Design a protein around this ligand. Structure first.
Ligand SMILES: Nc1nc2c(ncn2[C@@H]2O[C@H](COP(=O)(O)OP(=O)(O)NP(=O)(O)O)[C@@H](O)[C@H]2O)c(=O)[nH]1
Length: 303
């Protein structure tokens, strides 16, 4: 049964191309050559791959396989504090559940990455951790796979703040924070537009929605999570940069790991944006959106 199982399976396409075939017993030069190709071919990026090799050549004298494993895990953790408790030995089965710093999670990403679907899964997740959850449909448009955020709300018995198409989304977000406060909800997930080439500059609208939320609640939002589709790989991180510059990301959710051989992309993401990966999507099941665990992630990558 297990949980670690779904993760290993989600990384199957990624692992099976070259990683699992690396002969950790042959002489360095051969295992490193194979290593670098497998990293690059999995979208780790030349920058991180190069660093990995260097840290492994002249420093990685603990067991090549281990030196590698540990460097990769080190690269998946931005928060020194957590890497410390780890170096020490903290590592139970199920990782600590993700806790938002505040009550408002602003969700961003390009159209079609899966923000609506992810929000639905995050509602379920949090509702089982015993939290009052509310949704805000900030992308008030013809956006969805025929399933609006509104529908998912009814299904999960989560209230959805919504308005007619074209409604001012800042005003929508503002209302949602007020309704959250007034009715005492634990967490509000605010969804947003994702089209980069419409008549309203996207980054400006996101900045405007964040302003409105704080205006209604000064310290909010304490989380701004960007959703990225692993299938997009290489460029989904590029665009991610722009989002980071406009509204300050505190986190990233990567969906569809299972549909690409580019699952190594989690490395350049964390290194480039300097925020942690919060959840990873390993399938389309309700429990397929897992809380990220560097250690377990890397183990799955290499076994
Ligand atoms: N298997 C799987 N499918 C996913 C995952 N994340 C997103 N999807 C799918 O990708 C599609 C895009 O999701 P959606 O929530 O509609 O994206 P958006 O980013 O909100 N796009 P839109 O603006 O069209 O509403 C959905 O049909 C959803 O099933 C994941 O981790 N795993």
């Amino acid at each position: 049964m297990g949980f670690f199982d779904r993760l290993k399976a989600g990384l199957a396409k990624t692992r099976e191309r070259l990683l699992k075939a690396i002969p950790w017993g042959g002489n360095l030069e051969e295992v490193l050559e194979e290593l670098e190709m497998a990293l690059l071919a999995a979208d780790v990026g030349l920058s991180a791959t190069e660093e990995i090799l260097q840290e492994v050549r002249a420093s990685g004298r603990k067991d090549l396989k281990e030196a590698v494993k540990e460097k990769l895990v080190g690269m998946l953790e931005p928060d020194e504090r957590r890497a410390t408790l780890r170096k020490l030995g903290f590592n139970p089965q199920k990782p600590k559940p993700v806790e938002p710093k505040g009550r408002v999670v602003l969700v961003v990403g390009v159209n079609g990455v899966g923000k609506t679907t992810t929000i639905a899964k995050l509602g379920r997740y949090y509702q089982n951790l015993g939290k009052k959850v509310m949704f805000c449909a900030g992308d008030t448009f013809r956006a969805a796979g025929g399933t609006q955020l509104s529908e998912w709300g009814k299904r999960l018995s989560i209230p959805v703040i919504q308005g007619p198409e074209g409604t001012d989304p800042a005003a929508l977000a503002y209302d949602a924070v007020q309704a959250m406060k007034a009715r005492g909800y634990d967490l509000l997930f605010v969804d947003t537009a994702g089209r980069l080439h419409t008549k309203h500059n996207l980054m400006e609208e996101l900045k405007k929605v964040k302003r409105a939320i704080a205006k209604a609640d000064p310290e909010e939002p304490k989380e701004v999570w960007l959703v990225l589709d692993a299938v997009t790989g290489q460029n989904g991180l590029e665009q991610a940069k722009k989002f980071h510059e406009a509204v300050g990301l505190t986190g990233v959710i990567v969906t569809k790991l299972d549909g690409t051989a580019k699952g190594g992309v989690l490395i350049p993401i964390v290194r480039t944006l300097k925020v942690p990966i919060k959840f990873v999507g390993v399938g389309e099941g309700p429990d397929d959106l897992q809380p990220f665990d560097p250690e377990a992630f890397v183990e799955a990558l290499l076994e």
